[PDB]
A paper describes a structure:
a–e, Crystal structures of the five-repeat design E8 (a), two-repeat design H12 (b), and the three-repeat design H10 (c–e) are shown as gray cartoons; the loop, sheets, and helix of the design are shown in dark blue, magenta, and teal, respectively. Central pockets in the designs are shown as gray spheres (a–c). The approach generates a wide variety of structures strongly encoded by their amino acid sequences (as evaluated with RF and AF2, and further indicated by the close agreement between the crystal structures and design models), with between 2 and 7 repeat units (N), repeat lengths of 15 to 78 (L), and all ɑ-, ɑ/β-, and all β-folds.
In pseudocyclic proteins, such as TIM barrels, β barrels, and some helical transmembrane channels, a single subunit is repeated in a cyclic pattern, giving rise to a central cavity that can serve as a pocket for ligand binding or enzymatic activity. Inspired by these proteins, we devised a deep-learning-based approach to broadly exploring the space of closed repeat proteins starting from only a specification of the repeat number and length. Biophysical data for 38 structurally diverse pseudocyclic designs produced in Escherichia coli are consistent with the design models, and the three crystal structures we were able to obtain are very close to the designed structures. The large set of pseudocycles with central binding pockets described here combines the diversity of native protein scaffolds with the stability and robustness of de novo-designed proteins, and our RIF docking and Rosetta design calculations suggest that the designed pseudocycles provide better starting scaffolds for small-molecule binder design than do either native structures or previously designed de novo NTF2s.
Numbering used by the authors:
A (entry chain B), B (entry chain A): 4 to 139
The structure:
Amino acid sequence: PLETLPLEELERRALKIYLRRHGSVPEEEIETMPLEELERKALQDYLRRYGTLPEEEIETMPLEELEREALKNYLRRYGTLPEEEIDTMPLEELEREALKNYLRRYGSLPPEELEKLPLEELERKALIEYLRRYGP
Amino acid sequence: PLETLPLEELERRALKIYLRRHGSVPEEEIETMPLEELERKALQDYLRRYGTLPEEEIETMPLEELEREALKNYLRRYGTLPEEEIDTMPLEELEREALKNYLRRYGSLPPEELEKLPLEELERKALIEYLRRYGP
C-alpha cells in the first residue's frame, strides 16, 4: 500500500513510526505536527541516544546541524570510511553515503544499483524499506 | 537531455545560473561548492534583493528559516492567498504553493495537472522550466 504514497507522505509516516517507537509524545498529537518539526524531534531522539551532546544545544541547534550530526554518527557506527572526511563531506554526500549504507544492510538491493540510483530515489527506497519493516 | 539528469543535478545547475546572474559569486567554483552552500548563499541574495530583512540576521539564519522566509516573500508578491495564511502554512506547504505559482507564470502544463503532480515532481518541472529559460 506504500506505493501510492508519494515522497512527502513516506517521510511523514516513517518519522511517525520512529517517534512512536522512540521518545514519549502523545500519539494523537504526533499526526498534527508539521513535517519540519517531525524531523527536529525525531533527530533529537536520535542524537540524545547515540551521541550524548549538550542537552540544550540539541534543543536549539538548527535543523541542518541536527541532521549533520545524526548522519555523522550513522557513518561512525555503521561505516568503515575514515572519520576524517566525515566532517568535510558535504551534506549532499553524507545523506548519499548514509542511504547506501542503509540499503546494503537492511535492503535486498545489489550495490550496483545503490551506486547508480540517484539521491532522490535513494531516499525513496530507504523510506519504503523502513516502513515495511517497522510499520503497516 | 535535461530530463535524464537527476533532481540533485537539476538543482545544482539551477542554483548555479542563479548565482551567476543575480548577485556576486565568484564563478571560479562552477561545481566545487557543495549543494548546501549553493542553497544558502542563493537564499540570502533573494532575501536581500526581493525583501527587507536585516543583513546581520540572514548571514546567521539557519537554512530551514532562510527558505521559510523566501517562500513567505515569494508568496506575497506573486500569490493570491491572503497574508494571514502565509505565517500559518507549514514549510512543506509553502514549497508546494510556491512551486505551483511558478509553474503558472512560466508553465505550459494545465493547472489541473499541476495539482496532480506531487511535491517531488513539482520541483523537477520548476527546476527544468527554470533552466530552459536561463540556461544555454
